[PDB]
Design an enzyme around this catalytic site. Sequence first.
Site, PDB file in Angstrom:
ATOM      1  N   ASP A 166      -4.456   3.416  -0.567  1.00 37.13           N
ATOM      2  CA  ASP A 166      -5.320   2.485  -0.236  1.00 37.13           C
ATOM      3  C   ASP A 166      -6.247   2.977   1.272  1.00 37.13           C
ATOM      4  O   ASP A 166      -5.641   2.421   2.091  1.00 37.13           O
ATOM      5  CB  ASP A 166      -5.045   0.974  -0.306  1.00 37.13           C
ATOM      6  CG  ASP A 166      -6.084   0.198  -0.217  1.00 37.13           C
ATOM      7  OD1 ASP A 166      -7.515   0.214   0.053  1.00 37.13           O
ATOM      8  OD2 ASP A 166      -6.080  -1.003  -0.961  1.00 37.13           O
ATOM      9  N   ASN A 225       0.650  -1.216   0.030  1.00 37.71           N
ATOM     10  CA  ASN A 225      -0.034   0.060  -0.121  1.00 37.71           C
ATOM     11  C   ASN A 225       0.789   1.374  -0.038  1.00 37.71           C
ATOM     12  O   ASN A 225       0.395   2.152   0.316  1.00 37.71           O
ATOM     13  CB  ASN A 225      -0.948  -0.023   1.203  1.00 37.71           C
ATOM     14  CG  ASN A 225      -1.933  -1.277   0.647  1.00 37.71           C
ATOM     15  OD1 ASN A 225      -2.435  -1.325  -0.426  1.00 37.71           O
ATOM     16  ND2 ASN A 225      -2.570  -1.626   1.889  1.00 37.71           N
TER      17      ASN A 225
END
Length: 309
Positions: free
Chosen positions: A163, A150
């Site tokens: 994210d 992420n």
Amino acid sequence: GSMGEAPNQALLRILKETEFKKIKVLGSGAFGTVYKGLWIPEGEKVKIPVAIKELREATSPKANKEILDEAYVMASVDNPHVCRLLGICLTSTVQLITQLMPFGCLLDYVREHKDNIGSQYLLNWCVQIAKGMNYLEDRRLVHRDLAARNVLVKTPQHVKITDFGLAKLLGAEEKEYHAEGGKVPIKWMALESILHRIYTHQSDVWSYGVTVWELMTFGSKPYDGIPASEISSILEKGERLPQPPICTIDVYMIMVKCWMIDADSRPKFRELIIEFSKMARDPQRYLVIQGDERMHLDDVVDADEYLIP
Ligand SMILES: COCC[C@H]1CNC(=O)c2c1[nH]c(-c1ccncc1F)c2Nc1cccc(Cl)c1OC
Ligand SMILES: [Cl-]
């Protein structure tokens, strides 16, 4: 206490489907589907490379609810080390649109360039991720899914946290989020999050610790081969991820402090900025890496130069 809430005056930008040329699928998984494309805002003489995210859920109502929760959180975030929402597209399944991060996720980047990544890059990434997380803490945002998968790579010198699918806004002087038993990546979670579904800025610090371990191991899987259902018992016995070979005690001690049982004993993101910044000034004193010295890394406008009032 007594502190109230201020108005959120963030602008939600709705982008026309017809201003986008999807070039290709970048990837699909638990995050949904992400596409690469080109945005041409009708009025200007400007072309902007973008990524486009759709969710992949049981029904369209559920997918649209969850994706607009993620738009809400992101609309309010403006930091060089956090993904900026450019807007949404009201297709049947709603889409989020962001600046294209051409090198993809940092987990795959470190695995792919493992023989070419020096101590300067690794410590600078740790600094930039802590800056992004400190910004989110200041906005009272708990990310809840910080991991190397992420973090996105704009350039080898510039990374961004992405994210916001699990992110939550804390109220003024509210300390905790209490979750309701959805799926959550257990190998990046604080022990109080596994046992009690309590999330804080200090539970994000635990995830930061695991993220740093993933970077310092050139993208190893944490607790490799161990089922998720055994992680709780391993942590409660006092076991942690091992010292990466390149790490001095100075760097491993930071990671270990991130994985302390007492959440308030863990470092603050603002302290991790100071520590990693100090280490980035003398990188070969803190990481001991083979061949460190001898390894390098139209009207098209970068979205960080296209500023929307
Ligand atoms: C294919 O990527 C795998 C990881 C995946 C994991 N979870 C994500 O959320 C995400 C991923 N890639 C990209 C991404 C971004 C920018 N450029 C390239 C990329 F791949 C993500 N962000 C993203 C994509 C589209 C719109 C928005 Cl608002 C986004 O921010 C939340
Ligand atoms: Cl995973």
